[PDB]
Amino acid sequence: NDPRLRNPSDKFIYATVKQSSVDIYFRRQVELSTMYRHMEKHNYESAAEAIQAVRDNKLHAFIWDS
Amino acid sequence: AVLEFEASQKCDLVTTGELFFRSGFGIGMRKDSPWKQNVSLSILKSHENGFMEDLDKTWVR
Amino acid sequence: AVTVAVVFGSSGPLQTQARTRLTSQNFLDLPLEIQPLTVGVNNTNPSSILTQICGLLGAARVHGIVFEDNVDTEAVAQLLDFVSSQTHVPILSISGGSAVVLTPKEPGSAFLQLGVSLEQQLQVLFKVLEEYDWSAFAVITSLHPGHALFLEGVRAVADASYLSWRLLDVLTLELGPGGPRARTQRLLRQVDAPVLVAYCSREEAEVLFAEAAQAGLVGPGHVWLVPNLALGSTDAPPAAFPVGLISVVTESWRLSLRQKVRDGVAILALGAHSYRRQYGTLPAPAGDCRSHPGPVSPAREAFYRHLLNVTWEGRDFSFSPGGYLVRPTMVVIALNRHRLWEMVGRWDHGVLYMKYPVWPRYSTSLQPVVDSRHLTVATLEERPFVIVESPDPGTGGCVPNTVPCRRQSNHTFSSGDLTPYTKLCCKGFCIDILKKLAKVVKFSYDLYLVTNGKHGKRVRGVWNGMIGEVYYKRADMAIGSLTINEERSEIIDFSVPFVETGISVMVSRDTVSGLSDKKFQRPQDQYPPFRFGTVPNGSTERNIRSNYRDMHTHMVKFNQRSVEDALTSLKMGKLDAFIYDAAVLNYMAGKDEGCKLVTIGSGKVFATTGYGIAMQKDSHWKRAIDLALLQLLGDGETQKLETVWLSGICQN
Ligand SMILES: *[C@@H]1O[C@H](CO)[C@@H](O[C@@H]2O[C@H](CO)[C@@H](O)[C@H](O)[C@H]2NC(C)=O)[C@H](O)[C@H]1NC(C)=O
Ligand SMILES: *[C@@H]1O[C@H](CO)[C@@H](O[C@@H]2O[C@H](CO)[C@@H](O)[C@H](O)[C@H]2NC(C)=O)[C@H](O)[C@H]1NC(C)=O
Ligand SMILES: *[C@@H]1O[C@H](CO)[C@@H](O)[C@H](O)[C@H]1NC(C)=O
Ligand SMILES: *[C@@H]1O[C@H](CO)[C@@H](O)[C@H](O)[C@H]1NC(C)=O
Ligand SMILES: *[C@@H]1O[C@H](CO)[C@@H](O)[C@H](O)[C@H]1NC(C)=O
Numbered sequence A: 001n002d003p004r005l006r007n008p009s010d011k012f013i014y015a016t017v018k019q020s021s022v023d024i025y026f027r028r029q030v031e032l033s034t035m036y037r038h039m040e041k042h043n044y045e046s047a048a049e050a051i052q053a054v055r056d057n058k059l060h061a062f063i064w065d066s
Numbered sequence B: 001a002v003l004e005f006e007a008s009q010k011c012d013l014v015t016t017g018e019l020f021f022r023s024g025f026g027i028g029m030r031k032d033s034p035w036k037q038n039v040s041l042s043i044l045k046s047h048e049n050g051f052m053e054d055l056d057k058t059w060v061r
Numbered sequence C: 001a002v003t004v005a006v007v008f009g010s011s012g013p014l015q016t017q018a019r020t021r022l023t024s025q026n027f028l029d030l031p032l033e034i035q036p037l038t039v040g041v042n043n044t045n046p047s048s049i050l051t052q053i054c055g056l057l058g059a060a061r062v063h064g065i066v067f068e069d070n071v072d073t074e075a076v077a078q079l080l081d082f083v084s085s086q087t088h089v090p091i092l093s094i095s096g097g098s099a100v101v102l103t104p105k106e107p108g109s110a111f112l113q114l115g116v117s118l119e120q121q122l123q124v125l126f127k128v129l130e131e132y133d134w135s136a137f138a139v140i141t142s143l144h145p146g147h148a149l150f151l152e153g154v155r156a157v158a159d160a161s162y163l164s165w166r167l168l169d170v171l172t173l174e175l176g177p178g179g180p181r182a183r184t185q186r187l188l189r190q191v192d193a194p195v196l197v198a199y200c201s202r203e204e205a206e207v208l209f210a211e212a213a214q215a216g217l218v219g220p221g222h223v224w225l226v227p228n229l230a231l232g233s234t235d236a237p238p239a240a241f242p243v244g245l246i247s248v249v250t251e252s253w254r255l256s257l258r259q260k261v262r263d264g265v266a267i268l269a270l271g272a273h274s275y276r277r278q279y280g281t282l283p284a285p286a287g288d289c290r291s292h293p294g295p296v297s298p299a300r301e302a303f304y305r306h307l308l309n310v311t312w313e314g315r316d317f318s319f320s321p322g323g324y325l326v327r328p329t330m331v332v333i334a335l336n337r338h339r340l341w342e343m344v345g346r347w348d349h350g351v352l353y354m355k356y357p358v359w360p361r362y363s364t365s366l367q368p369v370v371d372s373r374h375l376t377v378a379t380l381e382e383r384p385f386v387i388v389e390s391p392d393p394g395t396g397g398c399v400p401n402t403v404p405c406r407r408q409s410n411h412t413f414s415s416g417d418l419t420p421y422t423k424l425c426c427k428g429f430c431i432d433i434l435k436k437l438a439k440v441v442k443f444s445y446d447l448y449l450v451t452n453g454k455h456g457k458r459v460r461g462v463w464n465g466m467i468g469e470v471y472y473k474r475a476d477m478a479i480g481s482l483t484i485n486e487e488r489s490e491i492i493d494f495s496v497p498f499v500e501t502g503i504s505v506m507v508s509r510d511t512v513s514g515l516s517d518k519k520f521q522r523p524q525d526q527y528p529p530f531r532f533g534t535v536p537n538g539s540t541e542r543n544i545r546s547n548y549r550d551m552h553t554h555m556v557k558f559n560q561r562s563v564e565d566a567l568t569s570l571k572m573g574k575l576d577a578f579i580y581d582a583a584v585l586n587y588m589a590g591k592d593e594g595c596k597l598v599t600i601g602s603g604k605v606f607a608t609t610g611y612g613i614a615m616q617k618d619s620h621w622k623r624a625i626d627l628a629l630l631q632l633l634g635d636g637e638t639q640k641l642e643t644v645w646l647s648g649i650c651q652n
């Protein structure tokens, strides 16, 4: 519900793994449609490379299982 | 509008939280009263020139 | 030694049609030296067709055949497929009843019909239904053969879609000459769906439409959709067809016979040319019916495979393995008031463009009816509240939770016949409010932007912008960032404000502390002139002009524009104070990297007013919309919209 997430910008980048449960969760939601559209353009192939990108600072935030 | 004035004037009391039902005060008349528009126009004019600012400053400090 | 035969079967002026050209100099633009041959089947009976085709094959040894006949034909497509299976000659049927698609075709046969299957027509019709948001339709069907395939296609297309279609009921009829008339009449008086889809032959279509006219299913409260089969000669439609009938056809619509013949010969010539480029030689000529070449002759299979995928004059002529046109551009045509088949929309690639943003409906007396519950809403782009985007190219349409909107059609962007309007998608706070109002008050609406001025200012006694559109009855209501003020409330009516706002001051991080400060009221009081300005032609400018003459006379120097540009000029240092709307200034402060601040902690909003929904003076919708807005404010939906649309980063 943070306004940085709900109001996306080219500058901010957050994404999740492609074709996963989080992808489905954001697809189903209608009030999260803008977030899904922003996320889909930068979605990652796997979780480990997503962690490496986060440590790299290429990806600001990573949404994944707890 | 009333609670904030009471808290400011009488002190010793505090208002908590943010406003959870935003509305306005309005002049009430019978249904389909012919001179509604008049009053509404006047009220809008009072908002435009200076009248509501003076009324706020003079009464609700 | 390439030889291409054209067979004319149309029962009109066939001799005038065969004689039309019967030449070899034609088809010059082609990557080949055509050698045509007109045989013109005289009457298109099975014996005549078989005998003439066999004689042609046993005399000229043609490489391919192009067939053409009239639209009343029913069973010739079977005979042509039979001939192609028996002699292994590639035929190509163009126009007439021979161009209806047969789905299973004699596996070893190259028929290659130049028509579109039933499923693609169903897809186009369902996308037409999606465009105007028509649901709860009913299906009318006769006992015409292939109706099971039609129903299965309807069910598959309805099931495999993102929208939630809702079929009401399917009714089967006889629609035969001289039979039970009470049964059809009784069944037709029991349907109440607003959208009806029918599937039958030409004569059955005429019978059904006559019965429906007797049953009161023709007026403006009923829209009919039919596939190609129900249509006949498009040039002369019958009187039984109701005005507003919708169908979907290929580009061959409105083309002349010679053009169709040229296109077929071109397809065959390009297939042969590709075969020659690939194998260095021409394909073998066809044999004769007094034999049976059991072996598949892989040379002929290769020729057929080359003939499948071929393009000509920028149009795709690819054929499905089922021998019909795959992914062709199709046009959606409708029967207008003049009782002519006007073309309405197009189906280029997987996306749909349609001429009419709203479907017209005419009375039973051909009198244009306008639905009283369809409101025309004018609006304008304002980043916090109204956002316009281009539709997603991938899916044709755009993302849900985004209402389609059109741009003003004053300037025609048709470029021929594509679309006279720019189709965008609008979203945001005001559009969400409008959607909630449409759900609650139960009305339908379109949405178009205003390209004639900003929100509105009286110039030379006339009004431009949204106020101009509403006052001059071009639109039912105006929604957006419209401030309630006396000069507008006198000329038009206003609804209850749904978000409060006013005049506010923006500075780069409390030097002024008041709109009526001596710095503003007296520009030349001290220091070189204060560089403060505002966007002209708005409520703020008129308020300043009518109240503080010195303020307005100084503000003329700094006539800012494009509030984002004013904001960036403030950031750079070309400006030190910006006078504008409080609702947008709070949002602009919220999503600021430097976190610009409004003059006083709460901005000390001056001339407090609100955003309203403009309406025509003394209208009817006013009371209902006022009550609906008050209900929305009462139930906390407006607070939810504030949280989801006007949140800020450093506002807390
Ligand atoms: C609202 O105010 C307007 C003034 O702008 C009133 O209009 C005048 O009304 C009087 C008597 O009703 C007339 O003699 C004047 O000729 C009107 N002026 C104009 C310019 O038309 C209006 O009547 C008021 N509304 C009501 C219900 O009294
Ligand atoms: C139609 O498609 C066929 C194949 O589906 C194309 O023929 C191929 O052409 C490429 C050229 O690089 C060859 O490598 C393949 O071996 C060919 N395949 C076959 C089965 O012939 C043909 O070129 C296409 N038509 C056009 C006009 O491009
Ligand atoms: C073909 O039709 C013409 C006139 O339409 C007729 O004169 C001719 O005899 C016909 N040929 C046949 C039936 O073989
Ligand atoms: C329509 O467009 C023309 C430009 O072709 C321009 O004068 C103006 O935007 C419009 N003219 C009107 C509304 O008279
Ligand atoms: C404001 O109106 C003036 C005069 O009509 C015009 O020249 C100016 O371009 C307008 N400013 C806008 C539309 O931002």
Ligand SMILES: N[C@@H](CCC(=O)O)C(=O)O
Residues within 6 Å of the ligand: C455, C456, C481, C482, C483, C535, C536, C537, C538, C539, C540, C541, C580, C581
């Ligand atoms: N809401 C304002 C637009 C901003 C302004 O010009 O003050 C109006 O409709 O007048």
